[PDB]
Amino acid sequence: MKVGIDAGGTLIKIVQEQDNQRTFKTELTKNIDQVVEWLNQQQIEKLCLTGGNAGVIAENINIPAQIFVEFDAASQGLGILLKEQGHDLADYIFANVGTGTSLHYFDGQSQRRVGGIGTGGGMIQGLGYLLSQITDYKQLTDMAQHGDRNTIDLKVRHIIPGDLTAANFGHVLHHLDADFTPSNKLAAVIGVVGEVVTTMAITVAREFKTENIVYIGSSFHNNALLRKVVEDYTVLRGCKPYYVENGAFSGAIGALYLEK
Amino acid sequence: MKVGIDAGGTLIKIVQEQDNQRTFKTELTKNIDQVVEWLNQQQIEKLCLTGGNAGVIAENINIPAQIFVEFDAASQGLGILLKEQGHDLADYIFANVGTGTSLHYFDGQSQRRVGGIGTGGGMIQGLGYLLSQITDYKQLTDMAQHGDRNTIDLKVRHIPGDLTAANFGHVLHHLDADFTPSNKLAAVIGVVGEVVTTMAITVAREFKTENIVYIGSSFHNNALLRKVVEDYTVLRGCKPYYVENGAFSGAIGALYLE
Ligand SMILES: Nc1ncnc2c1ncn2[C@@H]1O[C@H](COP(=O)(O)OP(=O)(O)NP(=O)(O)O)[C@@H](O)[C@H]1O
Ligand SMILES: Nc1ncnc2c1ncn2[C@@H]1O[C@H](COP(=O)(O)OP(=O)(O)NP(=O)(O)O)[C@@H](O)[C@H]1O
Ligand SMILES: [Mg+2]
Ligand SMILES: [Mg+2]
Numbered sequence A: 001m002k003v004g005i006d007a008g009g010t011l012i013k014i015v016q017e018q019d020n021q022r023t024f025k026t027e028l029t030k031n032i033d034q035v036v037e038w039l040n041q042q043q044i045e046k047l048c049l050t051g052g053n054a055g056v057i058a059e060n061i062n063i064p065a066q067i068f069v070e071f072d073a074a075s076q077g078l079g080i081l082l083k084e085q086g087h088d089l090a091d092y093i094f095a096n097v098g099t100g101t102s103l104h105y106f107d108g109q110s111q112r113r114v115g116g117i118g119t120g121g122g123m124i125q126g127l128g129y130l131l132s133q134i135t136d137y138k139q140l141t142d143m144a145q146h147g148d149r150n151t152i153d154l155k156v157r158h159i160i161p162g163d164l165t166a167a168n169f170g171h172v173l174h175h176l177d178a179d180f181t182p183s184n185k186l187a188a189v190i191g192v193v194g195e196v197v198t199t200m201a202i203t204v205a206r207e208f209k210t211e212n213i214v215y216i217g218s219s220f221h222n223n224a225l226l227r228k229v230v231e232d233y234t235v236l237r238g239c240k241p242y243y244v245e246n247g248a249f250s251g252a253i254g255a256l257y258l259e260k
Numbered sequence B: 001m002k003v004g005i006d007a008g009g010t011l012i013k014i015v016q017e018q019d020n021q022r023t024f025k026t027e028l029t030k031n032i033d034q035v036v037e038w039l040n041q042q043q044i045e046k047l048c049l050t051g052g053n054a055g056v057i058a059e060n061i062n063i064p065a066q067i068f069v070e071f072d073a074a075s076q077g078l079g080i081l082l083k084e085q086g087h088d089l090a091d092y093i094f095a096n097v098g099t100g101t102s103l104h105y106f107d108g109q110s111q112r113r114v115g116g117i118g119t120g121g122g123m124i125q126g127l128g129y130l131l132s133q134i135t136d137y138k139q140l141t142d143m144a145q146h147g148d149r150n151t152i153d154l155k156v157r158h159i160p161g162d163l164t165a166a167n168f169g170h171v172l173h174h175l176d177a178d179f180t181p182s183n184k185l186a187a188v189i190g191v192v193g194e195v196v197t198t199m200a201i202t203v204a205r206e207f208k209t210e211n212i213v214y215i216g217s218s219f220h221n222n223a224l225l226r227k228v229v230e231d232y233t234v235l236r237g238c239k240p241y242y243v244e245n246g247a248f249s250g251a252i253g254a255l256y257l258e
Helices: A029-040 A054-058 A070-084 A121-132 A137-144 A182-207 A224-236 A247-257 B029-040 B054-058 B070-084 B121-132 B137-145 B181-206 B223-235 B246-256
Strands: A002-007 A011-017 A022-028 A046-050 A092-097 A101-106 A111-117 A165-167 A212-216 A240-243 B002-007 B011-017 B022-028 B046-050 B092-097 B101-106 B113-117 B164-166 B211-215 B239-242
Touching: A002 A029, A002 A054, A002 A070, A002 A247, A011 A029, A011 A247, A022 A029, A022 A247, A029 A054, A046 A054, A046 A070, A046 A247, A070 A092, A070 A101, A070 A111, A070 A212, A070 A247, A092 A182, A101 A182, A111 A182, A111 B181, A121 A137, A121 A182, A121 B121, A121 B164, A137 A182, A165 A182, A165 B121, A182 A212, A182 A224, A182 B113, A182 B181, A212 A224, A212 A247, A224 A240, B002 B029, B002 B054, B002 B070, B002 B246, B011 B029, B011 B246, B022 B029, B022 B246, B029 B054, B046 B054, B046 B070, B046 B246, B070 B092, B070 B101, B070 B211, B070 B246, B092 B181, B101 B181, B113 B181, B121 B137, B121 B181, B137 B181, B137 B223, B164 B181, B181 B211, B181 B223, B211 B223, B211 B246, B223 B239
Parallel strands: A002 A046, A092 A212, A212 A240, B002 B046, B092 B211, B211 B239
Antiparallel strands: A002 A011, A011 A022, A092 A101, A101 A111, B002 B011, B011 B022, B092 B101, B101 B113
């Protein structure tokens, strides 16, 4: 088999390919040593790595490894997944919502980083923990799904489509009578992260004259709400959103594809 | 006397221009009736309004007032506040950090809105409350001035060093709980200031200008927020500009769009 790995600061994404069948696997970066042991007890044709922790895995294994720069790997992997899923875009902005968020413009041939921002999955987890004391990712995200943001966010609807948020968390001081439940607070956290990401995305989309915006990154994992927030807001701000199944593995898949 | 008022959704900013001496005053929008009561019992040579609640004031006062578009009023007033305070700029992006945040590109002639985001003073108050149960504004902002964001935010250094790789991204690695009300509130202010700067920085590049001016009542009694935006703006490659009384840009502008 062939193995493509994207070892990020939070999650390690692994793509195993064999007999024209690829398996996706995700492990926490805190358990990177476990990924190392797993690799050594495996017979591998080619190992391709990317991500900030590629080196940590490389210097502790017993076979050579081809390492690639993450932005180009992600870009290549994403292009492959898009085509496999029926999308044929001439150009687009792709936002990799990982620990933080990186924005890239793909002109149809190559990618270039055009922006980044501290709002992403790490904030969802971090701020999410501060507001609910929940550390388990699945528990955190599951809970957020059924939350109501109306008593927390101030929208145009309350005071440009009425669906636009005028101020995130700007309604709180108007509902001190309300029950700011864990579910509601988390939904608002996801709301602001999603909206900020989208607002940055549609801004660069306008700048680089593309109306297509592709969303990837593990932050969407087990979080339907985040995806809904971004897709909807993207439409509202006038661009076309595209979610990619297993898009979080764009880097791992791209790395494998780039092997020489 | 001449009076310029920017009646926003949260704060009513009032500027009084004597012969050539101006005084500033802020009141809560919830007490707009008091502002009207006040105005009627006043002798005003000229009253100019702007902001979403201008209409409420206009139809309840006993004298005819002129109402202006907030974007143009702010631009006009800001441009005056700059020229006065010595800033002569060929162009710039100005960020109005009010309840929410509005982004404008002034091309040297006029302004044009190029962006808007929900992160601003409303979030500071709302998320601030959810993290400290503090309702009083002065109290909330004061408490945040002395906080340390190091155990809360994940920085590039933790992995341009002082850049933030993930707001609140360090929280799970410091669950020891040195998450004092002050450190939390400071982190709330940090992400708001950074998101605003990032957006400003991006549209500044899109519209080819190295200048970014920051105004808004959100900066009131919050030196941390001003410091956050000014420092981050440097890191992203542009030059920041802060104007004293900049939150009164609209009020001032309304009196000068004559
Ligand atoms: N099992 C999981 N555990 C924790 N976080 C998860 C999990 N699944 C998804 N996530 C979320 O996904 C985010 C990580 O996204 P990801 O695209 O993997 O970034 P990364 O590669 O680790 N970081 P970077 O190196 O900065 O590119 C986390 O911050 C979570 O919000
Ligand atoms: N005394 C105060 N009380 C409440 N908020 C204050 C006060 N001083 C400053 N602020 C902050 O200032 C923000 C309001 O900024 P401001 O520029 O006045 O917006 P606005 O004009 O009311 N909004 P908009 O209707 O959207 O134009 C609040 O959300 C607070 O963060
Ligand atoms: Mg990554
Ligand atoms: Mg305002």
